[PDB]
């Protein structure tokens, strides 16, 4: 019924958006952590993809999923929408210092390493490019605006289909 695939730059507030959306529609939030557990029955990746596909296509469940190539995997399911959440450098830096209790220099390095890792993971499995507007239905930069605004824009999008 509603599947929301969330991509995000590290420290942009993408998890907070994902969660707020899941609370709004009262549906589950799936992540890497959950899928890691729930698929011990690159090999890992096939199991996770096939799981997201079960839930989407056959079980017809509603959920939010962060990452996991979900927008590529769920690509012909007419009930899923995707969004990529980004942020201002300074907004992200503060979010990552706070969450991880680290200094500025290290925050910035974590951001760069994590965004490289996401990009690599996504672009290996998908033909589309991580972070490019064509890969998603909506992209929102959090900075000029706050997480709640991003979340509401996404619900508007979804509620108006």
């Amino acid at each position: 019924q509603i599947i929301i695939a969330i991509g995000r730059e590290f420290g942009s507030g993408g998890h907070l958006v994902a969660k707020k959306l899941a609370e709004h529609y009262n549906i589950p939030l799936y992540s890497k952590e959950l899928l890691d557990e729930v698929a011990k029955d690159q090999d890992i990746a096939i199991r996770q993809f096939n799981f997201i596909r079960k839930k989407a296509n056959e079980e017809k469940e509603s959920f939010v999923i962060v990452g996991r190539c979900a927008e590529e995997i769920l690509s012909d399911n007419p009930n899923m929408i995707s969004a990529f959440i980004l942020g201002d450098k300074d907004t992200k830096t503060k979010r990552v210092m706070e969450r991880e209790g680290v200094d500025e220099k290290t925050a910035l390095n974590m951001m760069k390493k994590m965004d490289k890792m996401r990009k690599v993971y996504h672009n290996f499995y998908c033909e589309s490019k991580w972070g490019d507007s064509r890969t998603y239905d909506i992209c929102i930069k959090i900075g000029k605006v706050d997480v709640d605004t991003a979340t509401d824009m996404i619900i508007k999008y979804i509620d108006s289909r």
Copy 2:
């Protein structure tokens, strides 16, 4: 300026219609390549704005004049406006009153809009779409270091398809007004 909206777009996406709808909602002018072709056709310039410095490097004069029109209207006259294309999100980088949005669509939706707009068949529609998009990407990536169509180049990107032009316009207005 008080509100400046810089719109980029894929050909056929409905991006002009969104730009128009926004200009009407806020009752401000809509500037385009067409208008700048007119009003921008008549040493101090190193405001360290990348497209201009780049334009100046020895080896279009038109491009500079248009950039400078846009920069003056935004920064010196403090006018509010909508500007489509023309590297405006890059030029007006340092202006904290500027928002930018990239409008895109799915193939079917765009091809339908283009055939209908241009009295053309599917084949042609899709060729036009690819040419104009390459054209805009080339113009943009020549003058800017950021990448045409990349989410990081903009504040908002909205794909028109699952949602219509009115829904995209409303979402841009919400972004703007909640800032």
Copy 3:
């Protein structure tokens, strides 16, 4: 044609000198943008050559004429020549007598060659290099689907720096003659 050599290059790399040295070694003409500006300035064309089909899509006439000059000289007149730039490796794709080579250099080497060539300082040299390279990349990637400067676009790429122009030229000749 019997031998056709299509040369691409970074600005300042020594690529014109290699093209010249090759043309002299094989005693064939050296065609450039300059010459094509002259000799190529005066319906059948869908030889399914990508740059031409792309050029034809409705929305440069010059570009078509130059592509067609190159294509005719290669394929119909069977002439041997060196051609710098002008998308020649793409245009002459199907001609099994064509080799292509991309010439590049390290920064120091290029900046030195450019300052000396253009009576210019370091700062300017490096700005020129970046502008011309963006210019060539844009021209090339607009008309072709392959990527300017990517090794897959060419048969050979040689960085001039650790080795001189004579060494690069010899290596291209070895490639050609051992085929």
Copy 4:
């Protein structure tokens, strides 16, 4: 004295070039296989990089190395040269069917997957782009010419510095 860093598209003949060059100069051929062994004293990657660096910079050894970001790692060692070996699609296909005893369809899929994996590995650790001419001193497409010709062009390059 001489360090040769070899990159390559899967099935292009890059290993055969690397080996022939090592025989020519009578120096060792290091690969992933060797480095895998010789560095149990992404964590793995640091150990391998630091090993290549020892051999290069401190021990001053001569060698050929395939892959392993060697051109990036050995970047200010004025005695190393890099080359990227590529191939014609049809030449590569036959080389991979023969070596791996597989059909055409599968050869082509192996090529695509292996080239994606190399690209990802390289582009994660390096700032330069796998396969781009600027990343290397020489790039050669084997197809119009054979492995021995590629190998000789590289020796010319090296011998003329």
